Amino acid sequence: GSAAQYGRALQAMEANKYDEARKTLQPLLAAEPGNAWYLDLATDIDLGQNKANEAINRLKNARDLRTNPVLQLNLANAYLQGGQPQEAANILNRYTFNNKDDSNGWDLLAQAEAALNNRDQELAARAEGYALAGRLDQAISLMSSASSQVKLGSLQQARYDARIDQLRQLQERFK
C-alpha cells in the first residue's frame, strides 16, 4: 500500500538512490500533492539531484505551506540550495521564532544569514545553535558580539542582551 511505497522510497532516499526513490514516491505525490510528508521526501529527492527550482515551485504550490512547519523548513532549505538565501531567511526568521528548540532551523538560518552578509543575525543564529549544543559560554560570547554590532539603544540590541541574560541564568542550573 501507500505505507509500503513510502517506506521503500524513504529507504532508497537514505541510501542516496534518488532515482529509485523518485520512481517509488511519485505516484503518492501525484495523488496527494499536499501531503506534507510526501512533499518532505520529494524535496529531499529533488535537492539530491540538483533540482532545487523544481522543489521550490512544488512547495510554493502547497496550501498548507504558510501554516505547516514541515513545509516551511523544506522550502527554506530548497531556497538555500537554489541560490535564494533571502527567501530562505524570510522563512527561517519566522521558523526559528516559532520552533526555538529546532537546531536544524538555527543552522539553516546561520547559513542563510552568512550568504546574505547579515553578520549579527548570523552570529545570533550560530549562538542559538551553540546553546542547543550546550556550549553556553560560547553562545554568550557570540551573542555579545551580535549585540555590539547593532545600533546602541535599538530594540535589536535589547533583544540580543535579553538572550544573553537568558543564557546566563541557564548556565546557573548546571553549576
Short mmCIF file of C-alpha atoms in Angstrom, two decimals:
data_model
loop_
_atom_site.label_atom_id
_atom_site.label_comp_id
_atom_site.label_asym_id
_atom_site.label_seq_id
_atom_site.Cartn_x
_atom_site.Cartn_y
_atom_site.Cartn_z
CA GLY A 1 0.00 0.00 0.00
CA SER A 2 0.92 3.66 0.32
CA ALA A 3 2.76 2.90 3.58
CA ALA A 4 4.88 0.27 1.80
CA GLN A 5 5.64 2.56 -1.14
CA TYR A 6 6.54 5.47 1.16
CA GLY A 7 8.83 3.23 3.22
CA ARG A 8 10.56 1.89 0.11
CA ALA A 9 11.12 5.40 -1.24
CA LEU A 10 12.48 6.68 2.07
CA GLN A 11 14.91 3.75 2.32
CA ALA A 12 16.17 4.48 -1.20
CA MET A 13 16.49 8.17 -0.27
CA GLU A 14 18.69 7.41 2.71
CA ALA A 15 20.91 5.22 0.52
CA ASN A 16 21.24 8.22 -1.86
CA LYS A 17 19.44 6.24 -4.58
CA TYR A 18 17.47 9.30 -5.64
CA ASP A 19 16.15 7.94 -8.96
CA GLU A 20 14.83 4.77 -7.30
CA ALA A 21 13.27 6.87 -4.52
CA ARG A 22 11.66 9.22 -7.06
CA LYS A 23 10.05 6.42 -9.06
CA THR A 24 8.51 4.98 -5.90
CA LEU A 25 7.36 8.28 -4.36
CA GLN A 26 6.00 9.95 -7.48
CA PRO A 27 2.55 8.22 -7.62
CA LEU A 28 1.95 9.01 -3.95
CA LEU A 29 2.74 12.67 -4.55
CA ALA A 30 0.63 12.91 -7.72
CA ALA A 31 -2.42 11.64 -5.84
CA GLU A 32 -1.81 13.80 -2.73
CA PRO A 33 0.29 16.77 -3.89
CA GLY A 34 -0.07 18.46 -0.49
CA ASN A 35 0.73 15.68 1.85
CA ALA A 36 3.40 17.35 3.96
CA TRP A 37 5.49 14.19 4.28
CA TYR A 38 5.28 13.24 0.60
CA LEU A 39 6.42 16.82 -0.07
CA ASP A 40 9.20 16.44 2.51
CA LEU A 41 10.56 13.40 0.69
CA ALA A 42 10.03 14.92 -2.77
CA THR A 43 12.06 17.94 -1.66
CA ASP A 44 14.95 15.77 -0.47
CA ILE A 45 14.92 13.76 -3.72
CA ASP A 46 14.92 16.87 -5.92
CA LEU A 47 17.66 18.61 -3.91
CA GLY A 48 19.68 15.40 -4.06
CA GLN A 49 19.51 15.62 -7.87
CA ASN A 50 20.27 19.38 -8.04
CA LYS A 51 16.67 20.24 -8.85
CA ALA A 52 16.07 22.99 -6.30
CA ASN A 53 13.86 25.05 -8.59
CA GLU A 54 11.58 22.05 -9.06
CA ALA A 55 11.44 21.61 -5.29
CA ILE A 56 10.73 25.32 -4.73
CA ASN A 57 7.86 25.50 -7.24
CA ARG A 58 6.24 22.39 -5.79
CA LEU A 59 6.32 23.74 -2.24
CA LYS A 60 5.13 27.19 -3.32
CA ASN A 61 2.03 25.37 -4.67
CA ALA A 62 1.07 23.63 -1.36
CA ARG A 63 -1.95 25.07 0.54
CA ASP A 64 -0.65 24.34 3.99
CA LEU A 65 2.71 25.98 3.23
CA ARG A 66 2.29 29.01 5.48
CA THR A 67 0.87 27.02 8.43
CA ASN A 68 2.85 23.74 8.31
CA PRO A 69 6.37 23.87 9.84
CA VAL A 70 7.47 20.81 7.84
CA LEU A 71 6.63 22.61 4.60
CA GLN A 72 8.24 25.86 5.81
CA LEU A 73 11.55 24.22 6.73
CA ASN A 74 11.65 22.32 3.44
CA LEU A 75 11.00 25.42 1.35
CA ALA A 76 13.70 27.30 3.27
CA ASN A 77 16.19 24.53 2.59
CA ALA A 78 15.21 24.41 -1.09
CA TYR A 79 15.61 28.17 -1.43
CA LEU A 80 19.05 27.94 0.20
CA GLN A 81 20.22 25.23 -2.21
CA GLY A 82 18.56 27.06 -5.13
CA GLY A 83 20.68 30.18 -4.66
CA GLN A 84 17.93 32.16 -2.92
CA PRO A 85 19.20 32.79 0.62
CA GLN A 86 16.99 35.88 1.00
CA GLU A 87 13.74 33.95 0.64
CA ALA A 88 15.19 31.22 2.88
CA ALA A 89 15.96 33.76 5.60
CA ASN A 90 12.46 35.26 5.31
CA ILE A 91 11.04 31.83 6.14
CA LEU A 92 13.67 30.94 8.73
CA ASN A 93 13.23 34.10 10.79
CA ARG A 94 9.61 33.04 11.34
CA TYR A 95 10.50 29.35 11.69
CA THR A 96 13.17 29.79 14.36
CA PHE A 97 10.86 32.09 16.32
CA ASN A 98 8.03 29.53 16.28
CA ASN A 99 10.30 26.45 16.72
CA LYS A 100 13.02 27.69 19.08
CA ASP A 101 14.30 24.21 20.04
CA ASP A 102 14.94 23.03 16.46
CA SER A 103 18.69 23.07 15.83
CA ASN A 104 18.16 22.40 12.11
CA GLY A 105 16.31 25.70 11.79
CA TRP A 106 19.06 27.66 13.55
CA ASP A 107 21.77 26.02 11.44
CA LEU A 108 19.90 26.83 8.23
CA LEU A 109 19.31 30.41 9.37
CA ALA A 110 23.01 30.79 10.14
CA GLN A 111 23.83 29.57 6.63
CA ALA A 112 21.32 31.95 5.04
CA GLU A 113 22.50 34.99 7.00
CA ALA A 114 26.12 34.20 6.15
CA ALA A 115 25.16 34.05 2.47
CA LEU A 116 23.34 37.41 2.86
CA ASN A 117 26.24 39.14 4.69
CA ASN A 118 23.94 39.79 7.68
CA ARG A 119 26.59 39.41 10.35
CA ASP A 120 24.91 39.92 13.73
CA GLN A 121 21.98 37.76 12.61
CA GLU A 122 24.48 35.08 11.58
CA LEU A 123 26.18 35.39 14.96
CA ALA A 124 22.87 35.14 16.80
CA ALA A 125 21.86 32.02 14.88
CA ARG A 126 25.24 30.39 15.47
CA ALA A 127 24.91 31.30 19.17
CA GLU A 128 21.48 29.65 19.36
CA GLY A 129 22.97 26.53 17.77
CA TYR A 130 25.73 26.52 20.36
CA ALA A 131 23.17 26.97 23.15
CA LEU A 132 21.23 23.93 21.91
CA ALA A 133 24.55 22.03 21.88
CA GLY A 134 25.16 23.12 25.48
CA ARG A 135 28.07 25.42 24.64
CA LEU A 136 26.59 28.19 26.73
CA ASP A 137 29.74 30.25 27.37
CA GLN A 138 30.44 30.31 23.63
CA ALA A 139 26.81 31.19 22.86
CA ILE A 140 27.06 34.16 25.25
CA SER A 141 30.29 35.28 23.55
CA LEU A 142 28.73 35.26 20.07
CA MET A 143 25.52 36.90 21.31
CA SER A 144 27.64 39.61 22.96
CA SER A 145 29.32 40.28 19.62
CA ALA A 146 25.93 40.39 17.85
CA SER A 147 24.59 42.89 20.39
CA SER A 148 27.69 45.07 19.95
CA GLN A 149 27.15 45.39 16.18
CA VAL A 150 23.60 46.81 16.06
CA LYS A 151 22.74 50.38 16.95
CA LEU A 152 23.12 51.27 20.63
CA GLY A 153 19.71 51.54 22.30
CA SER A 154 17.86 49.76 19.48
CA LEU A 155 15.24 47.11 20.16
CA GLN A 156 17.52 44.66 18.32
CA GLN A 157 20.29 45.35 20.82
CA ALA A 158 17.83 44.86 23.68
CA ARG A 159 16.69 41.52 22.23
CA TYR A 160 20.27 40.26 21.99
CA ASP A 161 21.06 41.41 25.55
CA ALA A 162 17.89 39.71 26.80
CA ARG A 163 19.04 36.47 25.16
CA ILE A 164 22.40 36.84 26.94
CA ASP A 165 20.56 37.16 30.24
CA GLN A 166 18.56 34.03 29.47
CA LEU A 167 21.69 32.06 28.60
CA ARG A 168 23.46 33.14 31.80
CA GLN A 169 20.78 32.11 34.15
CA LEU A 170 20.53 28.75 32.29
CA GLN A 171 24.23 28.21 32.95
CA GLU A 172 23.33 28.64 36.60
CA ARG A 173 21.23 25.47 36.66
CA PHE A 174 24.32 23.45 35.63
CA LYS A 175 26.83 24.78 38.19
#
